[PDB]
Design a protein around this nucleic acid. Structure first.
Ligand SMILES: Cc1cn([C@H]2C[C@H](O)[C@@H](COP(=O)(O)OP(=O)(O)OP(=O)(O)O)O2)c(=O)[nH]c1=O
Ligand SMILES: [Mg+2]
Lengths: 419, 218, 1005
DNA sequence: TGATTACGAATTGC
DNA sequence: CGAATTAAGCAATTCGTAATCA
């Protein structure tokens, strides 16, 4: 009845319009306002909803799987990359498509995304693809602009974009394999491409094409490949040496790849990609046994269980490398924000993040143990229940708990003086 | 259109097909109160008591409701002043003009806007005696307002004190909004923003908003 | 004025607002005092200096302290100290409402501020000084300085009071009466003036009698009047027209009575009188203020209450009178509904439940029996009340089923002697009660006559006097005075509000005395939390004495012991893993020593967490502990007052008062656990529950397996404080004063929150009571600590356990001996539930008795008991189905009407709505009603029941079963047999029988 | 057409 | 003729109907 009620109703309607583009926080706020409205006005046309499957398909069409025809207007061509797809919303987090969660992103991507959102009101969402720890902004939709200005803006803020092609067409051509090959070459890039997204000036709906064919080839070995510090990527090579690309560890788990067997793969002009939709306990240990015992599944990658030590602490804080404990306090005072980061977090979180353990698995392992702690330091530990050791990740982590306790005691006794 | 005959005045009630399942009980309830009701001069004239029974109910979305007709010069349709003399219609027209933007208007009428049905809770009143026929009308008002509620989507009440227990008076829940009376002290009705809220509520339930600028008379 | 005793306080709703006081002097003169009324706000000195328009008046309040009572979770032990500010406060008064952006203490009423700031008690006796009073009218005075007028208080003295009780009876032909078609036939009054005179008179409408009948009535003793001015109140029967009747009623309701008491008069009686007066004539009932500047008409308004459970929903309705002259209009219907619980709330049911007595047969023969009652039959006082009610009564119910007509009545000095018209009864002592009358009002109205008019006159005068009888029985005056004293509320507002309002007076007084303000700055979040601990029973049938031990005010005493207040909580410490849990435990045990701080472990708040510790401070006493101390002191006072009582009425009144104070003390906890309350504290509630669980576990552990040998007693485990180490001895070997040759074993069987059921291997009750008393003294002196004490409740014989909250037993009180009559106690069984049946209870009672007798005898060859019980049940059910001699009154169930349902389909609400649609009498939003299951007569026994709720029908007072309808016996029979089967031990035979009759699968424990 | 589980409502004991 | 300060907690059983499964 008052102005505050009108603003609440408008903001609830705004949230209702974009509900597939949501996460935990938006759903919680929407539910709270629905409760307030149904309490105040005794009935409201919308109800409380709790599952919420994130989808984008209302802005897309059915993929073209064979040659087709085009004719009118100017067209803008964009590439489609390989890897997990994410969508950034207004004041929200990265949310995984289909299984909406809140992925964690560094700081620079966060700042860039926040400022490009702050550039103007009319961004429905931003599309991102993660490919071997390489963020790539792929596309952005709006009812006012075209994905050109925002592309340049993102470039000048520091997050990479693909090169966008503006072209014109008059006559009646059948968009075919040869034209697709030429236009794909016209991108002049080495990252994997799977499809093309093209628009007509003004139309909201965006349609994509995909020319491919089936193939069968043998699987010769599953081996890891370094893509960073402590982060490994899966890979399978062929008899001819071809490289079958795999998005994620989850892709192998759900695709049930087998050593020394035959699988079905869709191959394209350059590369090939393994196909999904073929239990879990057998595979999750078979892969680790094949590659090597000293590997543990860190989220969507493979990590090492190495000896680690003093300098593995240093690289995370982004400080000058040191081999002396006394140096670990010297420049922290000189550093403006490193000490703030130290004080804001806790010892357990930083100690876990320094050796890169998974969150849930390590928490379960800790909750399945017993400790003897003296002077806020760990001196002894043991296992109480051995059922949790069935998971290969848990046993690999238990393999080097000594390094964890060493770095834990170091961080504790340096926090005793850093604050 | 169908008509039924009652024992007392006006001896003829004409109703639309949307008011079918209520007419029999309305006649039965009216037969026992007409004799005492008509002992006194009432506004409006008894011939104008049931003239909103003609309006269809399957094409309405919003209902604006008062507690009584005008004590003097009752026309028959709620919230009407052909000469533009009543204070309530003045303030309502002022609010609608402020919301829309039209400056020069000769008159306002709520019975012309599509999807809006003006209503009076009590259908009669003594001349110069506000709320003097409540006991006679109670059951009829209950029944008719309950029937209207089943068809509309948003129900808007004018008067905080008059409709303090509107939820107890109805069985099935409906979107109820209660606002200050137009003649409220302290000029409270000026700061009310119930019309935009109404439009937001209907657009929240996949219902077309209401054009309040349509009711102006030039 | 000088000496005055307060009666009522009320407000004025005119152009200018005022507060009124009604008081009476020693001689009997009535004095009114009028007070200006303000709007009270509490502001800081800075805000007071920054008020752009100067306030009307401001009074300093001194240095005070403000605490933020918001609760935040903490993952480490660097807990920030609570935000606490000290500043000078002011109290500003405004004639009109004002908005202040930074105003605090906004949860209290204006009348509470008036009382507490001016130092005035609502029910005190004062010695006013006229220097501060100005006379404006005969009987009214004006006071501008209430603080100096009410400065002197005097001892309480007695004053005379005036009352009016009335009841009416309206004509009807086929249904509930209608104001537009049906007239009033009778109207009765009970009139008490300030001199103490009691007058009874009934007015008969002559407009529905023939002239010859009128002449006969006048010749028989009645008085005929034609005008209002020619009536005398000193005559019982007066016959006149309807207009004169309404004018007399209007004249009587316009006086300045202290109380006008009715039964459901705010919905039917006064409404009917007002509407009929406005229909026949144009007159209205006018109430005027003591200063005669505001005049209002009678118009009954409705106050609707909503439920605080899910989807809110309306769950009660109440009707009130809008008078502004000081008279209190009291409806006993609402008071009885809100006070105590029955199956129905009609006048007949309340009279039957309240006015009963046992009677001895004195004479027999023909169709009459003479009964005698005295102090040697039932108790001290019951016979007196029965004789008091019998002065106007007409029909007496004998043995709960037979309705009898009174022929002659004799009132002895101490008891009563009544003769009734009933068949011969072959016993010596029977039960008498005042209940239903076997008269048909509709038939008597169809053929009206002079004798019928006189009979209805008697019935109406009895109905009018029942109001006074119930008024004296329920002790409304004492409760009103005590509530006005304690809650700091006007006398007319005591029985209107729940716990959230009646505690604001003491809370405000306590805050002002302590100089504390509580504020919030965040949003309150709600989480589930656990409750008390209930033990599973070990056996069903015991055959040994069971000792009952209970805690005295467990939760308030826990709050006092732990200092659990939202403003004394140091913090909540949580950990998500076993490592930080250990580190935080080690550091917490030494940062917060255990003689001052108390730490309580709790169930984790969220699934991710695994630990939760709440630390409380005990250096400064909190607010909730002092509220609880006040309420406990009041309960103790009324408990000793009950202990000193002699008559039944005083005992009942005092027991009810102490029960209400207990309930309020527990409601303090309930509010402290309520989300939408201003005293919300999640941690405090969880801590109180956890400490209660610790206490029950401690008592059960120390009592289980506790033998006594020679003159010495042994406890099972070491007796140590389960929170921190104390200075008391922890030796489980304790002196006893009992004789040496006693040897017994003790065992724990059942428990529920503040209770431990202890079993003793004995059979007599004198030794059991002596041992229980000694054990209670020992536990109080050695086992318990601080402010924890137990009480020996009773000794239970023949205890039977059905479920976790269902048992039956015979009770011997603490003050009892072997040669005493046992009392039957039922808790949760299918005899105290209001929605089971009336025919079910008789069958289960007789079958439990038969089972107990048969088990006492004992054959049980292979399955003898089960076979015999099944055969008897089958025969009884078949006989009941074939004969159909059981009345419909035995198959009636009760349910409450409310609008608080999830989803609007809800067959129950639809049934009630349809009944309201198709009948004149309406079921309101807090009204209990009767219903039963009815099916067509041609339908034969049904094996599979597909729908049940479709056969529910509402049984009105005028319901008569049709010739094409029958009671749907199958539901009742299924429920009764399912309940009976559970008591037996065999399964296969029960399954086979239940399948044979109903074809379904029985459920067991 | 059985079997089983889950949910809401009503009432009682703390 | 105009207006207009409410609200205790959880544990336990019994019954019918809707929803899901051999
Ligand atoms: C009766 C009742 C109890 N309770 C709670 C608080 C009590 O500590 C607990 C145990 O119930 P009771 O046994 O009634 O508690 P009590 O200790 O107050 O009894 P008494 O002083 O007569 O011996 O249940 C409520 O919350 N509300 C209630 O209405
Ligand atoms: Mg107790």
């Amino acid at each position: 009845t008052s102005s505050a009620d009108l603003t609440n109703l408008k903001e609830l309607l705004s949230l209702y319009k974009s509900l597939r583009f949501s996460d935990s926080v938006a759903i919680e706020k929407y539910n709270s306002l629905v409760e307030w409205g149904t309490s105040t006005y005794w009935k409201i046309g919308v109800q409380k909803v709790t599952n919420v499957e994130t989808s984008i398909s209302d802005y897309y069409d059915e993929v073209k799987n064979k040659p087709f025809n085009i004719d009118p207007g100017y067209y803008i061509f964009l590439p489609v990359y390989f890897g997990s797809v994410f969508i950034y919303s207004k004041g929200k987090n990265m949310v995984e498509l289909g299984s909406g969660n809140s992925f964690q992103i560094p700081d620079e991507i966060r700042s860039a995304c926040n400022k490009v959102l702050d550039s103007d009101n009319g961004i429905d969402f931003l599309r991102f693809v993660l490919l071997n720890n390489r963020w790539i902004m792929e596309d952005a939709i709006s009812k006012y602009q075209s994905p050109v200005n925002i592309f340049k803006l993102a470039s000048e803020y520091g997050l990479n974009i693909p090169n966008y092609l503006e072209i014109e067409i008059e006559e009646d051509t059948l968009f075919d394999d040869e034209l697709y090959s030429i236009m794909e070459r016209s991108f002049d890039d080495t990252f994997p491409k799977i499809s093309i997204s093209y628009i007509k000036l003004g139309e909201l709906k965006r349609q994509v094409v995909d020319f491919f064919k089936f193939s069968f080839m043998y699987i010769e070995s599953i081996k890891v490949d370094r893509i960073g510090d402590n982060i490994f990527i899966p890979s399978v090579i062929t008899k001819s040496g071809k490289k079958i690309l795999v998005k994620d560890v989850d892709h192998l788990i759900r695709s049930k790849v087998r050593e020394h067997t035959f699988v079905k793969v869709k191959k394209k002009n350059t590369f090939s990609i393994l196909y999904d939709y073929d239990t879990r306990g057998e595979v999750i240990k078979r892969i680790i046994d094949t590659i090597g015992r000293d590997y543990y599944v860190n989220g969507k990658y493979f990590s090492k269980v190495g000896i680690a030590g003093l300098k593995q602490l240093t690289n995370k804080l982004d400080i000058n490398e040191c081999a002396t404990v006394d140096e670990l306090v010297d420049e922290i005072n000189k550093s403006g924000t490193v000490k703030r980061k130290i004080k804001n977090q806790s010892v357990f979180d930083l100690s876990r993040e320094c050796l890169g353990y998974p969150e849930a698995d390590f928490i379960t392992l800790v909750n399945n143990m017993r400790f003897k702690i003296e002077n806020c330091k760990v001196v002894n530990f043991n296992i109480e229940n051995t059922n949790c050791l069935n998971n290969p990740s848990i046993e690999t982590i238990y393999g080097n708990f000594n390094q964890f306790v060493s770095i834990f005691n170091t961080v504790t006794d340096v926090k005793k003086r850093l604050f | 259109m169908n008509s039924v005959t009652i024992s007392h005045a006006p001896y003829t009630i004409t109703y639309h097909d949307d008011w079918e399942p209520v007419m029999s009980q309305l006649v039965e309830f009216y037969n026992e109160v007409a004799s005492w009701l008509l002992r006194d001069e009432t506004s409006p004239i008894p011939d104008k008591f049931f003239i909103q029974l003609k309006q269809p109910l399957r094409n309405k979305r919003v209902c604006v409701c008062g507690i009584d007709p005008y004590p003097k010069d009752g026309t028959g349709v709620p919230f009407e002043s052909p000469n533009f003399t009543k204070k309530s219609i003045k303030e309502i027209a002022s609010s609608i003009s402020r919301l829309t933007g039209v400056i020069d208007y000769k008159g306002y009428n709520l019975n012309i806007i599509d999807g809006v049905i003006p209503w009076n809770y009590y259908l009669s009143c003594k001349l110069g005696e506000t709320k003097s026929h409540a006991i006679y009308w109670d059951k009829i008002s209950k029944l008719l307002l309950q029937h209207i509620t089943k068809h509309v989507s948003v129900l808007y009440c004018l008067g905080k004190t008059d409709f303090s227990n509107i939820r107890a008076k109805l069985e099935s829940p409906v979107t109820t909004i209660v606002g200050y009376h137009p003649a409220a002290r302290d000029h409270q009705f000026e700061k009310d923003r119930s019309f935009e809220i109404i439009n937001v509520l209907l657009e929240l339930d996949n219902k077309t908003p209401i054009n309040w600028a349509q009711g102006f008379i030039y | 004025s000088m000496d005055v005793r307060c009666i009522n306080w009320f407000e004025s709703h005119g152009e200018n607002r005022f507060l009124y006081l009604k008081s009476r002097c020693r001689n009997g003169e009535t004095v009114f005092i009028r007070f200006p009324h303000y709007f009270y706000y509490v502001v800081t000195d800075e805000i007071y200096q920054s008020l752009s328009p100067p306030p009307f008046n401001a009074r300093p309040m001194g240095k005070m302290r403000t605490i933020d009572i918001d609760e935040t979770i903490s993952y480490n032990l660097d807990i920030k100290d609570r935000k606490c500010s000290v500043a000078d406060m002011w109290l500003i008064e405004e004639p009109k409402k004002r908005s202040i952006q930074n105003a605090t203490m906004d949860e209290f009423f204006n009348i509470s501020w008036f009382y507490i700031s001016n130092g005035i008690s609502p029910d005190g006796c004062y010695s006013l000084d006229e220097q501060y009073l100005t006379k404006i009218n005969n009987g009214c005075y004006h006071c501008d300085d209430p603080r100096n007028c009410f400065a002197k208080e005097i001892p309480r003295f007695d004053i005379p009071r005036s009352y009016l009780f009335l009841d009416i009876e309206c004509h009807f032909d086929k249904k509930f009466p209608s104001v537009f078609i049906n007239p009033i036939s009778h109207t009765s009054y009970c009139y008490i003036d300030l001199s103490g005179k009691r007058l009874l008179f009934t007015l008969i409408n002559e407009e529905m009698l023939t002239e010859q009948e009128i002449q006969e009535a006048v010749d028989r003793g009645c008085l005929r009047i034609q005008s209002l001015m020619e009536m005398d109140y000193e005559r019982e029967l007066v016959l006149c027209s309807e207009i004169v009747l309404l004018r007399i009623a209007k004249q009587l309701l316009e006086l300045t009575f202290d109380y006008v008491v009715t039964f459901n008069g705010h919905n039917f009686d006064l409404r009917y009188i007002t509407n009929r007066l406005e229909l026949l004539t144009g007159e209205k009932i006018i109430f005027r203020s003591p200063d005669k500047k505001e005049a209002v008409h009678l118009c009954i308004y409705e106050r609707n209450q909503s439920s605080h459970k899910g989807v809110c929903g309306m769950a009660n309705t109440t009707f009130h009178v809008n008078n502004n002259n000081g008279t209190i209009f009291f409806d006993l219907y609402s008071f009885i509904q809100k006070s105590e619980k029955l199956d129905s709330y009609k006048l007949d049911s309340i009279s039957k439940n309240a006015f009963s007595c046992m009677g001895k047969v004195l004479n027999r023969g023909v169709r009459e029996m003479t009964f005698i009652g005295d102090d040697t039959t039932d108790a001290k006082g019951k016979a007196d009340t029965f004789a008091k009610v019998l002065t106007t009564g007409n029909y007496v119910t004998v043995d709960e089923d037979i309705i009898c007509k009174v022929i002659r009545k004799d009132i002895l000095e101490n008891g009563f002697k009544v003769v009734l018209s009933c068949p011969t009864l072959p016993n010596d002592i029977y039960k008498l009660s005042f209940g239903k009358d076997d008269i048909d009002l509709a038939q008597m109205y169809k053929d009206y006559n002079l004798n019928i008019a006189l009979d209805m006159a008697r019935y109406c005068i009895h109905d009018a006097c029942l109001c006074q009888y119930l008024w004296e029985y329920y002790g409304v005056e004492t409760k009103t005075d005590a509530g006005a004293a304690t809650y700091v509320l006007p006398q007319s507002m005591v029985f209107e509000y729940r716990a959230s309002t009646i505690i604001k007076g003491p809370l405000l007084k306590l805050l002002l005395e302590t100089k504390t303000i509580l504020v919030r700055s965040e949003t309150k979040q709600k989480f589930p939390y656990e409750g008390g601990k209930v033990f599973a029973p070990k056996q069903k049938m015991f055959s040994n004495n069971v000792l009952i031990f209970d805690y005295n005010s467990l939760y308030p005493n826990v709050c006092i012991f732990g200092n659990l207040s939202p403003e004394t909580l140091v913090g909540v410490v949580v950990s998500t893993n076993r490592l930080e849990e250990e580190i935080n435990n080690q550091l917490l045990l030494q940062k917060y020593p255990p003689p001052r701080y108390i730490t309580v472990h709790c169930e984790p708040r969220l699934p991710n967490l695994i630990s939760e510790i709440a630390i409380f401070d005990r250096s400064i006493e909190g607010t909730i502990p002092r509220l609880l101390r006040t309420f406990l002191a009041e309960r103790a006072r009324y408990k000793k007052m009950l202990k000193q009582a002699t008559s039944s009425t005083e005992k009942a009144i005092y027991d009810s008062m102490q029960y209400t104070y207990k309930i309020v003390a527990n409601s303090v906890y309930g509010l402290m656990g309520f989300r939408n309350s201003a005293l919300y504290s999640y941690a405090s509630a969880k801590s109180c529950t956890s400490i209660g669980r610790r206490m029950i576990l401690y008592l059960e552990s120390v009592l289980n397996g506790a033998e006594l040998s020679n003159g010495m007693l042994r406890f099972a485990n070491t007796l140590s404080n389960p929170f921190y180490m104390d200075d008391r001895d922890i030796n489980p070997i304790v002196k006893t004063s009992l004789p040496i040759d006693y040897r017994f074993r003790f065992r724990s069987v059942y428990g529920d929150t503040d209770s431990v059921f202890t079993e003793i291997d004995s059979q007599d009750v004198d030794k059991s009571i002596e041992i229980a008393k000694e054990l209670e003294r020992l536990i109080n002196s050695r086992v318990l600590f601080n402010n924890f004490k137990i009480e020996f409740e009773a000794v239970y014989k023949n205890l039977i356990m059905q479920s976790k909250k269902k048992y039956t037993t015979m009770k011997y009180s603490a003050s009892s001996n072997s040669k005493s009559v046992p009392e039957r106690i039922n808790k949760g069984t299918s005899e105290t539930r209001r929605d089971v049946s009336k025919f079910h209870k008789n069958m289960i009672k007789t079958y439990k008795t038969r089972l107990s007798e048969m088990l006492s005898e004992g054959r049980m060859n292979s399955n003898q008991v089960c076979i015999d019980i099944l055969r008897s049940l089958e025969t009884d059910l078949r006989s009941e189905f074939d004969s159909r001699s059981s009345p419909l009154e035995l198959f009636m169930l009760s349910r409450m009407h409310h609008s608080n349902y999830k989803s609007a389909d809800n067959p129950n609400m639809y049934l009630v709505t349809e009944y309201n649609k198709n009948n004149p009498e309406t079921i309101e939003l807090g009204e209990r009603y009767y219903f039963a299951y009815i099916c067509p007569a041609n339908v034969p026994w049904t094996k599979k029941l597909v729908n049940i709720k479709t056969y529910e029908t509402i049984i009105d007072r005028s319901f008569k079963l049709g010739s094409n309808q029958r009671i749907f016996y199958e539901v009742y029979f299924k429920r009764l047999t399912s309940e009976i089967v559970n008591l037996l031990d065999n399964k296969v035979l029960c399954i086979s029988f239940f399948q044979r009759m109903f074809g379904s699968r029985p459920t067991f424990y």
